């Protein structure tokens, strides 16, 4: 629970004065609640014993004032507690999001796009719940216990030994129960985590599960996880079921000892009768508050693990930032250098790109050809500066991508990745990610360029046709054409087609390429493709094998001098 | 919109089934509550005995109670005699500590019995709560496995995930956190009311005035707070949706310069959800102080009136002490219910969402017949299908596939090839017509066996978080190590696995890992081929795989492709060449079909498609 304290200390400091106001108001309210029985004892002693009804009425008015103070201070504490809890939760969420948005591809891949979502909302909620339950109930038990001890000492110090001995017994019993419960609760949380991951995997790959008839194995796995979770929860509940009886028993035994010892003191003229009522109410308030506070302690292990996850997210430091003072060329539209680039993924034993050196002149088309796992997508990601070169330099427009701020470099680059993603909403909304200010006319022009205008015009809603979460309401080629249209609507200086024509038929692929050549004539294009038929039109073709460039030149020189490209052409020949 | 009362009563019915264990739970709770409520009367009797002895000790022993009363009347202020009138002392006796000890021993025994009964009832409640939760989780998982694909395609993954896991966990927390409190409160209120009615009707009426007023205040607060709760839930859902869409497509958002817009939208949603949560939480927490205030007003009235009666002599002091204890033990359950109202409402909302998911329409009545392919011949007969009915995607389609024939499907980008092979796997219900494999309608056989008989390479590759060996063995986990190694070698997964320093043990994920798109497709191919399917479907199975590796893979799988009726979908004509039958479909209808030689001889769409390679 080291990370819990750090997170609370960091993100509750702006609300520390509201917390102090909550604390003082709760103290006042609990003091009023424990002082009402003192006024009852005063009625019993200075009233019916003396025979003064006027004193009884006066003390009733005093009790009315005490109750008014109690309700006012309770409402005032609830309001500020809610304020502080919601503020802490909102600030923690806004900090986690702001940290995650600075992550790189590798940093985000460390946790995943779903773990970050579950840590941004449900991990902050489980700590704001602790905040609220501490400013509402967990603070009541110490306040009520110490205040009741003081009030019992005030009423009659002779019988304060009871109230000072009974409370430690309850404290030790509840401490034993907590010490035997907390490991079980940690196990229950760590085991419900697994049954949640199982259900997430079952829903993310439902089509693959159905296609392979993996329903019975999924059922068996879920049944085993459910049974183990139920065993852990039953073991926790067996201990948790002792909390209320072991507190009520202490209250009742304390009350019986009260009636005995107070009676013994009363026979000696050392105690008034109303003190018995006062002490009885003190017991049934002090110990009931402790019981209520302790019964709720299902949060601390859960909050501890949630805070551990949040702190591990917030401790991750990015590796690709604007260096100190980025160079800002006007309208970057130049060439790509790639001089002796050497890249090795973090945690990898061997580099994936070795001694890569090829230049792409501005306004030309360069096709990257290689085997599976050769490093074409890695090179494309290097151009986008999603990853930083371990050695060498890239030199886009004659200047390193490292010293260029990555907002203008990305504004000058229109990238359609191999693993594309279409956001849920409308086709117009998805295309707006390219421009965000595009009119309907240029949106339709971008759709027409990417051959995506027909299947959007077909829908009765036109540009407002719905899009599923991952575009699963479209075909794969339709998703690729939508991504191409999104890249086109940007009108970027550099196009990076990372296998953007894999799911397009020959006719549609040729039409899209012709429209692009008509539109992107003045723009640099780097296209990663498998078909040789699409690479003759490229001015320069680069072949990479094992991660290193094995051939540079046009189609004819590569077919004549590079054995790998000759093998590719021979394999694809009809 | 959303019915919370019905979901609450359904959840209560699930929690407390027919009288097998819930009857014992209720009986134990009632017995313990009655035994523990009896005790304060005993304590009041002991206090009455102490006061009687103390008062009577001071009075002279030569006079009885009536003489003492008349002597006090002869004395001043009059009220002492009224106090003694209802006291029933024996003057000059003192306190009898033996009777006090007996009374307190009886109280201690009753309190011990009540504590034991409460413990047993709590254990039984825990057992039944866990049983109910197990049943709920099993039902949720079965419903997940029975839902149609349109249900998942029409919603975000995060929303369904939260409705499936987070809502169930919230329900579990709420029940195991509040069921015992609810039962104890509902029994204790009535037991205390009965014993207060036994003590004195006036003071118990004064105490019971609170319940109407407390209910009115609670109703007002709930009326003011329910819109806040629904707004908070809506706002949390919107925030979670925005977070999921930003995180899943982080590369696209970051690259296309939309990070600032996403940050601004998140800030707006965060502020709005903060406001909604603050309002809901404040109005939900306001219940307990109000109930405590009304209970304290009743306590003040009861104390004052009881003191007035005790001074007059109509009620003994021990009875009034018992009644004060009863007032406190009556006000406490209402305060506890008011305090836990927030958790109760959260659990009710979660149960509402879970029941909404569980009441969704399922696919269809699955046939119990086990699919059994004998030869492998596939036939389509006027198959018509359409997602979102009103726009056909496949209409008037008919095709025949010989048992050893390799059928290749080529066509435009939105023809319907994936829809066709999904209809073959019974992913979606065929609108009109039927599909027959070896003369039996696929709709008349179980989906499980039919989909197990066919090994399909999905167009969108998917891998679950685990080792590469686990992902390959996902097709058939019972296969031994040698079979998985052979499947990986045939698909040339082993070629790049040997390169990695943790071969077959490196952990890969759908969104990343130590893998590439081509290698991910290779692992999917190995997973498909491991299951030794009797029917082969390959939907753009090598779209991201180079042709040099494709040649080796084709040679390696030629043993399987000989006698398994492969369905090959590809936009590369080289892969689909030399297929026994080639289907060209344009807009969900097969415009032309035949082998390569006939297709070239008759010209048509295929000839134009293959002349693009030669240029024009
Ligand atoms: N939920 C859905 N899933 C898939 N297709 C859908 C869905 N709803 C509607 N459709 C429509 O179904 C049509 C049939 O396309 P299909 O999914 O069969 O792709 P395809 O012909 O295999 O394409 P490609 O060759 O690019 O893979 C598409 O035009 C698409 O708009
Ligand atoms: N985190 C990682 N992400 C991607 N590749 C990684 C990673 N770690 C290691 N690699 C290695 O990087 C190599 C090259 O991957 P990359 O995706 O760049 O290849 P590629 O030739 O572009 O792929 P494909 O032809 O399938 O599109 C792979 O062989 C893989 O083992
Ligand atoms: Mg790639
Ligand atoms: Mg498809």
Residue numbers in the entry:
A (entry chain A): -1 to 572
B (entry chain B): 14 to 629
Give verbatim excerpts from the published study on this entry:
Here, we determine mycobacterial MsRv1273c/72c to be an isoniazid efflux pump and determine several structures by cryo-electron microscopy showing specific asymmetrical features including an N-terminal extending loop and a periplasmic helical hairpin only found in MsRv1272c. Confirmation that this is correct was achieved by mutating both E553Q and D497N, creating the double mutant, which has little activity.
An approach to obtain the Occ state of ABC transporter is to inactivate the ATPase activity by making a glutamate to glutamine (EtoQ) mutation in the Walker B motif of NBD. Based on this, we purified the E553Q mutant which had a significantly diminished ATPase activity and then added ATP before data collection. We then solved the cryo-EM structure of E553Q mutant in the presence of ATP at 3.1 Å resolution, which showed an ATP-bound Occ state. In the Occ structure, the central cavity in the TM region is sealed at both the cytoplasmic and periplasmic sides. The two NBDs are fully closed and interact with each other in an antiparallel manner. ATP is clamped between the dimer interface at the consensus and degenerate NBSs. Taking ATP binding at the degenerate site for example, the α- and β-phosphate group of ATP binds in the groove formed by Walker A motif of MsRv1273c, while the γ-phosphate group is stabilized by Mg2+ and helix α6 of MsRv1272c. In the ATP-bound Occ structure, the NBDs are fully dimerized with distances of 6.8 Å and 6.1 Å at the two NBSs.
